[PDB]
Design a protein around this ligand. Structure first.
Ligand SMILES: O=C(O)c1c(C(=O)O)c(C(=O)O)c(C(=O)O)c(C(=O)O)c1C(=O)O
Lengths: 235, 234, 235, 234
């Protein structure tokens, strides 16, 4: 099989330097362009998505939309899941990134940003950056919705959708496109490449450049992953 | 139950004077401005789509993606079916509307455009504007795929989707938005409103404006449809 | 592609000599056995269903359940649909066929029973043998549901499910088993082979014997349909 | 949200003294009798499932098929998953329970049968009792398909299907009937009522008796669960 991952580009809150996580923030004007370049890179580099999987965060959805518009496969099937969602930022959701570096001091800030398993404190159900009871998460077990998270966790929850849902399509021969977020794609790629806990910290999945994994029946790489634009992914 | 219909705005061929039908033509910059204006009226008028049904045509899918972006409901689930497609135009696909008028005359021209039962002529199997074999219709019975169509025919193939798929949702208390084409929606409004086989021709659906139908437990209008902007609709 | 068709054995009404149509009548002792016979024949001639389709009438559901148990293939995906139902018998629903022969006369009995396009009168909504408002049809447009039908009418509604739903599986390489009823299965074989309206009345499809169809890209049959027991079939 | 749980009865193997686990052993005469009694009990107590969930093991699919044939709800939708399956018994599958005891001993046997987190040894794919590669699991990530299991692990693979799939229907408003096994249902019940890591062994789920739950908006019990036969249960 063939799989193509795509991280949205800059978002409205990303240029204001605010932590996003699950707040359904829009895709910046720049993020719509990096979207189109991914589309164009799909068309150009001849990767052809038979089905699409996004998260339930609009910045991700808007990316696939614009990208598929440019590759002319706007008509392919569409599934969404909270399991493809970005990591939840807890208390840190909607807090100024730089204003938070000063309150926590470089070490606590960084463990929260790039550690595999330490989550920011949970958010209040009353917060304005809380999704407790959001309409797009109304048919999911209220008990499983996080109020914070870490890479570790994000993966504990993404895996089951990958195992059952996104895998039928792959083993069905189909070519799957996933348009999700930064933490969730690094999380998928870790499961995929076998990277250690210690190691996943060093992986950057460059925004707007689709990454193609050609997999075998056991859903493990055939050959090593290729970005559709090398020098761009490496620069 | 609440239903919302959205006719996609202009396309690249609406500018060129070319009969489109099923050719997968794109929204023009103007079409996009229209799609957006529709999503805004959904937002502003507090009409909240729980689910989405488009056609397999991009210009329709583009309209959905733009409109629900301005409505912030870009997350609602979405299903697609060739049965929401616009009327297949047969031979007349990939051709000039003005040249077609200089050829067949006013009468045969109107007939190809607005007759209920009279379909344009069948398109040659191996033509540059035929969708026979399109990747997007590869899991449908090959024999049911139209070489041409008439509003009559269009409705014969739309009704079943409405009856089993769109209704499952409407009857689950969901608000369904449909984004399709002029004739497929012409088709469905006829069915919903009991409009005559003679009177359907005179109905047009303003592009970029959401027709909201407030249906009862028998999927029949409990009161007349209202566009979320009836003045720009006059 | 390959399609298996299974007509069910007698119901508890085909036994007391009654018209059933849409009455959710239970399969009879003689017919549950024909269901089992059906099962061993799928296993015997190595015909392997990867997905099952039935209708909403309990006599057809029961037949496949009892049959895939014998084929050792219980586990497969299952789809049920009113469109695969048996022809709605209208006013004849729940009436002794012999009393019905004298209540009408041979010509009007032959019509109501074997014509292609003249449906029996409609059954009143109040009548105890009406399915109007019955729960299993609650998510279907109230107006499409028949009050009486003809073989023609049955093909009209059968076809859309076959064209959109069944074809998708077939065209994806799956061997589809359909367990339903007489007219609906005949309505379907009329399509598959271009049988004329004039001749359709002649076609029988025995109960408890699987009609397999080897199809091609065009879902038109590749070679003559065959029963996995041509004797008890041609007998 | 109303949920109904149905454990299946004695399989062919529960009489021959062998560990079954993931082996698709068919139900026997009494197994097929108790299922019909579960069905009669449902009709009687007026519990009408709106949709069905079963594992991918014949014994429980049969129970549902027999139980719902007896309830008159033969027609309700049917969904299936390997996550609803019975606990994998790894290298104890296909083996006799008494001879197992002669190899491991009281302690190590009581542990492989009743510890919450110690799985029996794994089984080599080569064995005629390993489901690795079985057709019914060809559309699930191969890597996740257990070659042994513990109740802890059963809950871990199960929860996500409950969370996303079972709950959608329960939250949609429907009455859900699950028909799985001892482990998966006890594993579910542990979660539903908060039964502790070291207290769950004591919980018996009678076979053939339907267990009903009445859940609130949080899919947490609204009242204490109840069997449609409080006599045959204890
Ligand atoms: O999509 C078309 O080409 C079309 C249009 C159009 O220009 O959007 C119109 C129109 O004038 O609005 C009509 C019409 O007569 O209302 C038709 C019509 O013939 O159905 C079409 C068309 O070609 O289907």
């Amino acid at each position: 099989p063939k799989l193509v991952l795509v991280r949205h580009g800059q978002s409205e809150w990303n240029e204001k330097n605010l932590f996003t996580g699950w707040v359904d923030v829009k895709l910046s004007a720049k993020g719509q362009q990096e979207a189109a370049r991914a589309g164009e890179l799909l068309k150009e580099k001849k990767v052809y998505p038979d089905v699409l999987y996004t998260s339930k965060l609009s910045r991700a959805i808007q990316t696939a939309n614009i990208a598929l518009e440019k590759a002319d496969r706007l008509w392919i099937p569409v599934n969404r899941s909270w399991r493809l969602n970005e990591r939840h930022y807890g208390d840190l959701q909607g807090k100024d990134k730089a204003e938070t570096l000063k309150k926590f001091g470089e070490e606590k800030f960084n463990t929260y940003r790039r550690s595999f398993d330490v989550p920011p404190p949970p958010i209040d159900a009353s917060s304005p950056f809380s999704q407790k009871g959001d309409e797009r998460y109304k048919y999911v077990d209220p008990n499983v919705l996080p109020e914070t998270e870490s890479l570790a966790l994000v993966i504990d929850r993404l895996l089951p959708y990958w195992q059952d849902v996104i895998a039928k399509d792959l083993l069905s021969g189909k070519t799957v496109m996933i348009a999700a977020h930064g933490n969730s794609l690094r999380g998928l790629v870790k499961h995929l490449e076998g990277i250690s806990d210690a190691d996943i910290a060093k992986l950057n999945i460059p925004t707007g450049i689709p990454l193609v994994f050609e997999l075998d029946e056991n859903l493990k790489p055939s050959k090593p992953s290729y970005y559709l634009d090398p020098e761009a992914a490496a620069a």
